[PDB]
Amino acid sequence: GIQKRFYVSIDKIPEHVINAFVATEDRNFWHHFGIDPVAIVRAAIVQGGSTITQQLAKNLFLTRERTLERKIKEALLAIKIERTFDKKKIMELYLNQIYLGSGAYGVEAAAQVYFGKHVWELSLDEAALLAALPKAPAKYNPFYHPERALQRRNLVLKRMLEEGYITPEQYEEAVNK
C-alpha cells in the first residue's frame, strides 16, 4: 500500500478536528461552491488563497506544478467536484489525503505518528496541531520545530475561538497544553 493506509469516514472524525481545519484553511467552507470570491478578495488585502476543495484538487494531479494555468485547472476541478459530491464527503476525502508531515497522509496516520492514538481519541489541542500543518508540514513539524509548531497551534486555537467553534474556557486550557 502506497500510503492509502488509515482511512476514516467523516462520521468517525471529531468535531474539533473538522472545525480546526475549517477555521484555519477555509473558514467559510460549508457555504461556498468550490472557490471563495470573498476569501479571494479579503485575501488580497492582507495570507489568503484557496478553499479546502481547491487543496483537494491540487493533490489529484500526478504532477506537482504551480503555474497559473494549473491553478485554474484546480479551481475548475474544485467547482465540478462541488457539483458532484456534498460538503461532508469532500471534507472526508480532503482530511484523509492531506499530507501532514513525517510520512503521514490523512488525519488518522497523523494522529498515530504524532500522538500514538486514533483520530477520534484526539483532544482539542491535539486537533489544533494537525490543522496547523497543511500550510507547511516541514516548517511546523513538532518533531524538529516544536517552537513554530506550538505557536501555530495556538494560532489555530485562536482561529477556532473566533469562529465560535470552542469556548473561551476551552481556549485558555488548550493553549496551555
* Interface ranges with a second copy (CB under 8 A): 1-4, 7, 9, 59-63, 76-77, 79-81, 83-86, 89, 93, 96-97
By C-beta, is 77 or 149 nearer to a second copy? 77
Q: Which amino acid is at 76?
A: L
Residues in CB range of 64: below 8 A, 6 or more apart: none
Q: How far is the CB of 82 from a second copy (least distance, A)?
A: 9
- Name the active-site residue from 25, 74, 92, 108: 25
Known active-site residue 173: no
Cell of 92: 472526508
Q: How far is the CB of 172 from a second copy (least distance, A)?
A: 38
- In DSSP notation, 114-127 reads HHSS-GGG--HHHH
By C-beta, is 104 or 161 nearer to a second copy? 104
Residue 21: phi and psi, rounded to 5, are -70, -40
Cα gap 88→141, rounded to integer Å: 27
Cell of 40: 479571494
Cell of 130: 494537525
By C-beta, is 37 or 168 nearer to a second copy? 37
Q: How far is the CB of 157 from a second copy (least distance, A)?
A: 29
By C-beta, is 112 or 170 nearer to a second copy? 112
Cell of 53: 476543495
Q: How far is the CB of 63 from a second copy (least distance, A)?
A: 8
Query: Catalytic residue numbers?
Result: 25
